[PDB]
């Protein structure tokens, strides 16, 4: 994928309505169904302290950035086979760009 900054505003709504049930973004935020995402863009997959990852997510060992995050969010199970993230993906590129524009800011 090739990330292009979009609407952080739309991204925030997308996170709230598509991700928040399983993820928090704030520093010190709790793990829920999925791991807290604070600092995700300075980290490899499967490395958030305090979260119980699948071996699949850990072994993928993807150094998260705006580009492979877009690739991942297109189809998480195709990108990380065996992951337990029950999310089909954001198929529209503009949605992924919006979400990641927000996530880059929100997870710092
Ligand atoms: C529950 C129903 C989830 C929804 C909705 C979303 N995610 Fe998720 N995510 C979930 C789990 C259980 C996991 C761990 C998977 C595993 O195999 O252990 C994840 C993982 C991620 C990651 C990787 C985090 C890391 O490696 O530290 C990312 C970057 C991520 N999820 C992002 C994300 C976004 C942006 C979502 C909304 C669009 C989203 N997830 C939905 C559970 C669930």
Last residue before each break in the chain (C–N > 2.5 Å): none
Domain parsing of the chain, residue ranges: 1-108
Which of 8, 34, 75, 99 for a ligand 1 pocket mutation test, highest count of atoms within 8 Å of Cβ?
34
Between the CA of 55 and the centroid of ligand 1 the distance, in Å, is 14
What residues are designated binding site? 19, 22-23, 85
Tell me the two tokens of residue 41: 């863009």
Instruction: Determine the atom of ligand 1 nearest the C-alpha atom of 80.
Output: 17
Q: Is 83 in the pocket of ligand 1 (CB under 6 A)?
A: yes
- Interatomic CA distance for residues 48 and 43, integer angstroms: 8
Between the CA of 2 and the centroid of ligand 1 the distance, in Å, is 20
Token match 């010190």: residue? 28
Instruction: Determine the atom of ligand 1 nearest the C-alpha atom of 44.
Output: 26
What are the φ/ψ torsions at residue 95 (nearest 5 degrees)? -65, -45
Number of other CB atoms surrounding residue 75 within 10 Å: 14
CA of 107: how far to CAs of 55, 56, 83, 96, in Å?
Answer: 24, 23, 21, 16
The closest of 15, 50, 18 to 35, measured between CA atoms, is 50
Rounded (10°) angle between helices 66-74 and 93-106: 130
CA of 83: how far to CAs of 21, 59, 65, 87, 98, in Å?
Answer: 17, 10, 18, 10, 24
CA of 33: how far to CAs of 3, 6, 20, 71, in Å?
Answer: 27, 27, 10, 22
Tell me the two tokens of residue 54: 């699948």
Q: Residue 41: CB partners within 8 Å, gap ≥ 6?
A: 64, 65, 66, 69, 103, 104, 107, 108
User: Can you give the resolution of this entry in Å?
Assistant: 1.7
Tell me the two tokens of residue 40: 């995700």
| β-strand partners of 72 | none
The closest of 47, 50, 48, 46 to 84, measured between CA atoms, is 46
Between the CA of 84 and the centroid of ligand 1 the distance, in Å, is 8
């Amino acid at each position: 994928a090739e990330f292009k900054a979009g609407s952080a505003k739309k991204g925030a709504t997308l996170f709230k309505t598509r991700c928040l049930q399983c993820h928090t973004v704030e520093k010190g935020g709790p793990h829920k169904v999925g791991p807290n995402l604070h600092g995700i863009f300075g980290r490899h997959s499967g490395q958030a302290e305090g979260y119980s990852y699948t071996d699949a997510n850990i072994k993928k060992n993807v150094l998260w950035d705006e580009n492979n995050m877009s690739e991942y969010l297109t189809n998480p199970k195709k990108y990380i086979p065996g992951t337990k993230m029950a999310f089909g993906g954001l198929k529209k590129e503009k949605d992924r760009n919006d979400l990641i524009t927000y996530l880059k800011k929100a997870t710092e």
